[PDB]
RNA sequence: UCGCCUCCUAAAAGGUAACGGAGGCGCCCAAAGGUCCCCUCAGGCGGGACGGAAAUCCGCCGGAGAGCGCAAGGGUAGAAG
RNA sequence: CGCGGGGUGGAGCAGCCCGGUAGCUCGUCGGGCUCAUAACCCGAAGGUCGUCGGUUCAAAUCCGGCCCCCGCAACCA
RNA sequence: GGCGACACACGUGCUACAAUGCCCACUACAAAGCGAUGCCACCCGGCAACGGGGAGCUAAUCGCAAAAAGGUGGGCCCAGUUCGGAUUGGGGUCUGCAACCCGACCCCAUGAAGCCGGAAUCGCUAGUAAUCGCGGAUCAGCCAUGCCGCGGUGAAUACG
């Protein structure tokens, strides 16, 4: 962890803070999975990238301290046989 | 034993210091 | 009640995290009750002590100061 | 005698028998012993029904214990699952949640091995 | 004994509250509380009926009545069970002795249950009697914890002269039955 | 296949045939007997720890669909259970 | 059509009488020995008993139908 | 992003299954190497990791540093346990642009398998094998239990 910290990339942090006071909210693709999420991210739809493609993720209040790459997993599985 | 980080021996093994292996001398 | 075959059920005294229940009237007089809820610790007469829900409560708090 | 929940420890020691309670041990134990100023070297067999309620009232009230504790850890994980998060998937699928390596022994979290052909 | 605090409590302050609430032309129409039947089913003791009489000894201790023994209606394969054998104890208490036990249950037993965020309020049987069941017997005062060889719970059934659950609910609430709302 | 019991055939008394249609008996029970006293089912729905379609319990509905050692039939709780 | 026997893990056979309990050899799977394979050794998996009905508390097991298998018979004409 | 995937299968290892043992306290005896873009005594803060401060050293001259087992004292009393610390919950520290995937470390909680291991199979003949700690290279940090080395204590047994 960090603490004197709580790092979030500013690429999107613009468009987030902007989609609060604009009056409009819509679909935003980012590569930044290293960042943390919320508070002003909530209600917003963000497309993260797993290395393959941009994945939509709905954002709510219990997703708080979690990095963005948590809700966009990097692998494909479905078991073995 | 050497694997319990909650003891003197554990700490020594892992090479660390703490409540169970204070740095003092 | 058939005469024979029976616990006594004689007036008693009894205790808890509270004072007495003079009521008693049981077998085996003078018993020690560990703690009750009624007598109002532990749930009834809601203490709500130690209280939870702090998990959504926290992550939204330590967060935007940092 | 019994502390929070039912959980009756006995004989042994007082500081040791306290561990047998869920949510408690070592540190939390030797803590509540001088916080009630009770001798830890003593055996739970014998001690004043006073310092018993001294000792119970403290612990039961200080921090949360076996019943409501486990219920909370249960709820933490439920939260971690179904939020959809990656910590939560490895709970869903019963696989190890913090790093490690699944190509070989995850056995504690994986169950016993269930073999197949080559 | 005919005194018994809960009995008393029922007459002064439970009855009248009840009449104020639903309102009742007749003294009888206001619910009485009849029959708490305590039933232990034990498959546990099946081929061993020796274990049984220790459990019966136990009910007596907390009830003050010796229980009778239920024996198996029909014979059924999948879990053992000759149609002969004893399944469990069932003890009927009324009239004082129910009261002196329900008190003990309200003010001692149920408190001592691990967790217990309160009695389930859907177990009213729709014609207004209520049922619950318990996992361990050592939640009772008369039991010492060193006299338990093994855990066996029971089924408590409480019969009520109230025609509905609503009314029935009211009675037991007002008596002091902790409810999970 | 050969004696015995039950049902149909059998034509509303009895009886009535065919290498007609279908089943059973060659035992069993010292309690599964006598009597006096009591008790009343199967099923359905609701409720109750381990109890699940079904172990036990509580509530209501349930005129007999249960039970009557075993086949069927007649009978039967106002008992034969 | 007739009488007798049968049908059970992948293969081949027990178990059915006498209700409650599925076993044996081989094969298959995982490991070992060997440079390696075979042999050999240590472990494991694998079945609802042709099927539909009925009997019983309970059916591979007792009773009935049907479907296959094998065996015997079909003479005087 | 992946090389870190997990129904499984093998090699090399680490930690154990305890009483010749575990824990806490006090008390000793090494060697070899590293370090002034670093090693950091010492004072404070903090349970602690660590953080403030801050002196000495281009280093037989200051620092890493406590060696550990051992010793002494006391505790545990044969228990899946004061054994064993895998898994998981919450709280943090540091590096780093950044620790979701994938870091190491501290604390509270959690305490799993494990009661010496089937067929089989490895090393070692002496200051060796066991066992105990210590340093370095790479390196921001670290998944090191690895590897190259250093010393402490120190067996057994070879008919053939
Ligand atoms: Mg330990
Ligand atoms: Mg991994
Ligand atoms: Mg209801
Ligand atoms: Mg009623
Ligand atoms: Mg007829
Ligand atoms: Mg006629
Ligand atoms: Mg006629
Ligand atoms: Mg008689
Ligand atoms: Mg009935
Ligand atoms: Mg019924
Ligand atoms: Mg029911
Ligand atoms: Mg009939
Ligand atoms: Mg009949
Ligand atoms: Mg009939
Ligand atoms: Mg076969
Ligand atoms: Mg093989
Ligand atoms: Mg071979
Ligand atoms: Mg057949
Ligand atoms: Mg059947
Ligand atoms: Mg001739
Ligand atoms: Mg690799
Ligand atoms: Mg290793
Ligand atoms: Mg075990
Ligand atoms: Mg990662
Ligand atoms: Mg042992
Ligand atoms: Mg081994
Ligand atoms: Mg040599
Ligand atoms: Mg390094
Ligand atoms: Mg090292």
Q: Which nucleotide is nearest to E126 (CA to C1')?
A: F46
Question: CB of A67 within 8 A of CB of A36?
Answer: yes
CA of E81 to the centre of ligand 3 (A): 32
CB-strand contact A32/H, under 7 Å: no
The two beta strands, E33-41 and E68-71, are unpaired
Interface test with D, best of E108, E111, E114 (most D CBs within 10 A): E114
* A76: in domain: yes
Half-sphere exposure of residue D54: CA atoms within 13 angstroms, side-chain side = 13
**Alpha-carbon torsion E143, E149, E151, E154, what sign?**
negative
Please give the C-alpha separations between residue C62 and each of A4, A7, A17, C4, D64, in angstroms, as whole numbers. 11, 14, 20, 70, 22
C-alpha span between E48 and E52 (Å, rounded): 7
C-alpha span between E90 and E156 (Å, rounded): 10
In angstroms, the first-to-last Cα distance of chain D is: 57
**Phi, psi values for residue A55, rounded to 5°:** -110, 125
Contact E141 C33 (CB under 8 A): yes
Q: Would you call D60 an interface residue with chain C, using a CB distance cutoff of 8 Å?
A: yes
Question: CB of E174 within 8 A of CB of E17?
Answer: yes
The two beta strands, E68-71 and E86-93, are antiparallel
In angstroms, the first-to-last Cα distance of chain A is: 38
Q: At what angle do helices D49-62 and D27-35 cross, to 10 degrees?
A: 130
Query: How distant is the alpha carbon of residue E64 from its chain centre?
Result: 13
CATH of the domain at A11: 3.30.860.10
Indicate contact of B with A: 3+ CB pairs under 8 A. Answer: no
> Annotated binding site of C, which residues?
16, 18, 36, 39
Question: CB of E114 within 8 A of CB of D5?
Answer: yes
* A1: in domain: no
**Phi, psi values for residue C19, rounded to 5°:** -85, -150
At C5, list the tokens. 């075959």
Name the residue among A55, A36, B8 with its Cα closest to residue C59.
A36
* A18: in domain: yes
**Total residues found in chain D within this entry:** 118
Exposure pattern of A27-59 as b/e (b: 16+ CB <10 Å)?
ebebebbebbbbeebbebebbbbeeeebeebeb
Name the residue among D79, D39, D80, D31 with its Cα closest to residue D58.
D31
CATH topology for E2-181 is 50s Ribosomal Protein L5; Chain: A, (3.30.1440)
Chain A residue numbers with beta carbons less than 8 Å from the beta carbon of C64 are 6, 39
Question: CB of E170 within 8 A of CB of E21?
Answer: yes
Query: Edge to edge, what strands does the sheet with A45-49 contain?
Result: A28-29, A45-49, A54-58
Q: Is E129 exposed, middle or buried (0-12, 13-18, 19+ CB in 10 A)?
A: buried
Q: How many CB atoms lie within 10 A of CB E76?
A: 11
> Annotated binding site of C for Zn(2+), which residues?
16, 18, 36, 39
Closest chain A CA to residue D116: A81
User: Which 8-state DSSP code applies to residue A70?
Assistant: G
Q: At what angle do helices E97-104 and E52-63 cross, to 10 degrees?
A: 90
At C61, list the tokens. 């708090």
Contact C66 A64 (CB under 8 A): no
- Using CB atoms, which chains have 3+ pairs under 8 A with B? none
Q: What is the resolution of this structure in A?
A: 3.0
Q: Among all chains, which residue has been given the structure tokens 């009314």? A: E167
Distance from CA of E58 to the nearest CA of D (A): 19
**Bridge partner residues of E133 (DSSP):** E155
Chain C residue numbers with beta carbons less than 8 Å from the beta carbon of E63 are 7
In chain E, domain spans: 2-181
Please give the C-alpha separations between residue B25 and each of B5, D22, D34, D103, in angstroms, as whole numbers. 21, 37, 27, 45
At C29, list the tokens. 């007089």
- Which experimental technique did the depositors report for determining this structure? X-ray
At D56, list the tokens. 């119970």
Nucleotides of G under 7 A from a protein CB: 20, 29-31, 57-58
**Bridge partner residues of E151 (DSSP):** none
Question: CB of A29 within 8 A of CB of A49?
Answer: yes
Question: CB of C14 within 8 A of CB of E67?
Answer: no
Q: Is D109 helix (H, G, I), strand (E, B) or coil?
A: helix
Of the candidates E104, E141, E178, the beta carbon closest to that of C43 is on: E178
Contact C59 A62 (CB under 8 A): yes
Question: CB of E153 within 8 A of CB of E136?
Answer: yes
Q: Among all chains, which residue has been given the structure tokens 């002091």? A: E176
3-state secondary structure chain B: CCCCCCCHHHHHHHCCCECCECCCC
Name the residue among D108, D112, D90 with its Cα closest to residue D99.
D90
Residues spanned by the domain of A81: 6-81
C-alpha span between D114 and D59 (Å, rounded): 44
* A52: in domain: yes
In angstroms, the first-to-last Cα distance of chain C is: 73
Helix (H) or strand (E) holding E131: strand E130-134
- Per the structure, how many domains does chain A have? 1
Half-sphere exposure of residue E144: CA atoms within 13 angstroms, side-chain side = 7
Question: CB of E86 within 8 A of CB of E71?
Answer: yes
Question: CB of A56 within 8 A of CB of A71?
Answer: no
C-alpha span between B20 and B18 (Å, rounded): 5
Contact C50 D61 (CB under 8 A): yes
3-state secondary structure A8-69: CCHHHHHHHHHHHCCCCCCCEECCCCCCCCCCCCCCCEEEEECCCCEEEEECCHHHCCCCHH
For E34, residues 6+ apart whose C-beta sits below 8 A from its C-beta are E94, E159, E160, E161
In angstroms, the first-to-last Cα distance of chain E is: 34
Query: Of chain D residues 87-106, which have a CB less than 8 A from chain A?
Result: 87, 89
CB-strand contact D10/H, under 7 Å: no
* A56: in domain: yes
Distance from CA of C53 to the nearest CA of A (A): 12
Distance from CA of E77 to the nearest CA of C (A): 35
Q: Is C57 helix (H, G, I), strand (E, B) or coil?
A: helix
**Alpha-carbon torsion D24, D29, D33, D38, what sign?**
positive
At E144, list the tokens. 């010492």
Contact D60 C52 (CB under 8 A): no
For B25, residues 6+ apart whose C-beta sits below 8 A from its C-beta are none
The two beta strands, E130-134 and C31-32, are unpaired
* A40: in domain: yes
Q: Is E158 helix (H, G, I), strand (E, B) or coil?
A: strand
In angstroms, the first-to-last Cα distance of chain B is: 24
Closest chain D CA to residue A74: D86
E1 CA vs F26 C1’ separation (Å): 68
**Alpha-carbon torsion E130, E133, E137, E141, what sign?**
negative
Please give the C-alpha separations between residue D15 and each of A31, B19, D12, D25, E34, in angstroms, as whole numbers. 53, 19, 9, 8, 49
């Amino acid at each position: 962890s960090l603490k004197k910290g709580v790092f979030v990339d500013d690429h999107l942090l613009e468009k987030v803070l902007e989609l609060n006071a604009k009056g409009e909210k819509r679909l935003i693709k980012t590569w930044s999975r290293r960042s943390t999420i919320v508070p002003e991210m909530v209600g917003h739809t963000i497309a993260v990238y797993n290395g393959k493609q941009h994945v939509p993720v709905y954002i709510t209040e219990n997703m708080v301290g979690h990095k963005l790459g948590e809700f966009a997993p990097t692998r494909t599985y479905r078991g073995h046989g | 034993g050497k694997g319990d980080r909650r003891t003197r021996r554990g700490k020594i093994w892992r090479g660390t210091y703490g409540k169970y292996r204070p740095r003092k001398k | 009640m058939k005469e024979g075959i029976h616990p006594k059920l004689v007036p008693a005294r009894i205790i808890c995290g509270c004072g007495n229940v003079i009521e008693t009237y049981s077998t085996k007089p003078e018993i020690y009750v560990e703690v009750c809820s009624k007598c109002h610790p532990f749930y009834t007469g809601q203490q709500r002590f130690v209280d939870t829900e702090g998990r959504v409560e926290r992550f939204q708090r330590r967060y935007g100061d940092s | 005698a019994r502390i929070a929940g039912v959980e009756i420890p006995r004989n042994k020691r007082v500081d040791v028998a306290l561990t047998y309670i869920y949510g408690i041990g070592k540190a939390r134990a030797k803590e509540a012993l001088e916080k009630t100023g009770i001798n830890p070297a003593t055996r739970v067999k014998d001690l004043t029904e006073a310092e018993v309620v001294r000792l119970r009232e403290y612990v039961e009230n200080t921090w949360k214990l076996e019943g409501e504790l486990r219920a909370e850890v249960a709820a933490n994980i439920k939260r971690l699952m179904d939020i959809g998060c990656y910590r939560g998937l490895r709970h869903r699928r019963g696989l190890p949640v913090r790093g490690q390596r699944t190509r070989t022994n995850a056995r504690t979290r994986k169950g016993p091995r269930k073999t197949v052909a080559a | 004994p005919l005194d018994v605090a809960l009995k008393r409590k029922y007459y002064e302050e439970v009855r009248p509250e009840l009449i104020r609430r639903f309102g009742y032309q007749n003294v009888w129409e206001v619910p009485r509380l009849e029959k708490v039947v305590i039933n232990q089913g034990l498959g546990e003791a099946k081929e061993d009926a020796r274990i049984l009489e220790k459990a019966a000894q136990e009910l007596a201790l907390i009830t003050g009545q010796k229980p009778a023994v239920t024996r198996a209606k029909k014979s059924i394969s999948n879990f053992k069970l000759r149609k002969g054998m004893p399944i469990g104890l069932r003890v009927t208490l009324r009239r004082d002795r129910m009261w002196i036990f329900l008190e003990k249950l309200l003010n001692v037993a149920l408190p001592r249950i691990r967790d217990f965020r309160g009695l389930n309020p859907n177990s009213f049987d729709g014609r207004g009697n209520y049922n619950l069941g318990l996992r361990e017997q050592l939640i009772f005062p008369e039991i010492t914890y060193d006299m338990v060889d093994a855990l066996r719970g029971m089924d408590i059934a409480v019969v009520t002269t109230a025609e509905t659950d609503e009314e029935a609910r009211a009675l037991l609430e007002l008596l002091g039955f902790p409810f999970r709302k």
